[PDB]
Write a protein that binds this ligand. Sequence first.
Ligand SMILES: Nc1ncnc2c1ncn2[C@@H]1O[C@H](CO)[C@@H](O)[C@H]1O
Ligand SMILES: Nc1ncnc2c1ncn2[C@@H]1O[C@H](CO)[C@@H](O)[C@H]1O
Lengths: 156, 154
Amino acid sequence: SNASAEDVLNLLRQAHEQEVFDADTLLRLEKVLDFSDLEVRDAMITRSRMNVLKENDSIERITAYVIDTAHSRFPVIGEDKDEVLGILHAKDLLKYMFNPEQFHLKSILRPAVFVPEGKSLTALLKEFREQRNHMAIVIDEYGGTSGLVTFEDIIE
Amino acid sequence: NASAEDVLNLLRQAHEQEVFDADTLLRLEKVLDFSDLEVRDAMITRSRMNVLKENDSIERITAYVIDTAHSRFPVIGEDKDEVLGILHAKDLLKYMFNPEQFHLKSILRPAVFVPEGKSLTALLKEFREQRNHMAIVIDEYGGTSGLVTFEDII
Ligand SMILES: Nc1ncnc2c1ncn2[C@@H]1O[C@H](CO)[C@@H](O)[C@H]1O
Ligand SMILES: Nc1ncnc2c1ncn2[C@@H]1O[C@H](CO)[C@@H](O)[C@H]1O
């Protein structure tokens, strides 16, 4: 026939009132339902607001910036934010705890995963869980950087 | 029981009607089929926990943290039945250019403790409210049973 999320909601609210499951479960199911309507667009941090690291910055300046912002992962850029070279994970810096003089950012930089703004959060979540990924870079329909999106932001 | 099955097949029907996609269906099914789960069911058991000893040197701590590659670690005193707090790996960066100043306890956060028989559903809720990611699971006498993470229950 034909249906809406509304019909599913009624169906579930019904089961709860018939005590098939409890209030907390009901809230969890409705949250999943609401989540299914969302896209990367809805959870991303926009380009002009991302905290990034410059390709050629010193270990001292990188480390201070990482501590200051307290993030765990950072896009690393070349000329500007439309040239993302990779992702640095804050804790990969600890490899240089005792030999900072040997710091080589390219030695610890990981490749960036790219996604479009229209991608469903359910697909993104599945891919984050599979790839053991935590951050993706969001690309606009022309190849430019639209922003970034994180696992911790979407599981909120 | 007949209540649960029924809710399920109507969820599948809503899927075949384009209400939501297969990925969502999976999430919904999981939240149901597994709504009776407890912390006990998702925990990393005591022997498999990767922990830090309170008095280990910055060298030993740092190598272990890099090797196991977790982002969070219980910190213990005498043994695993004495958890003193949780260390976030990135907080070690505080000592990058002054490793001689290392004081593990200055970067140690309070541990949260939960019972084995707590529902995952309730735990999930408390993790989200508390902006918490790890809990230490304890038995009926306060002994450590294991640890449990947001990652593992979602
Ligand atoms: N490298 C980054 N640049 C801009 N915002 C971030 C970055 N990493 C995490 N965030 C956001 O800040 C919060 C805490 O890090 C996260 O929930 C996320 O929304
Ligand atoms: N301190 C720790 N000791 C043992 N396993 C952990 C620790 N922190 C996260 N994990 C588990 O390692 C896996 C990868 O993060 C997850 O299943 C997570 O639960």
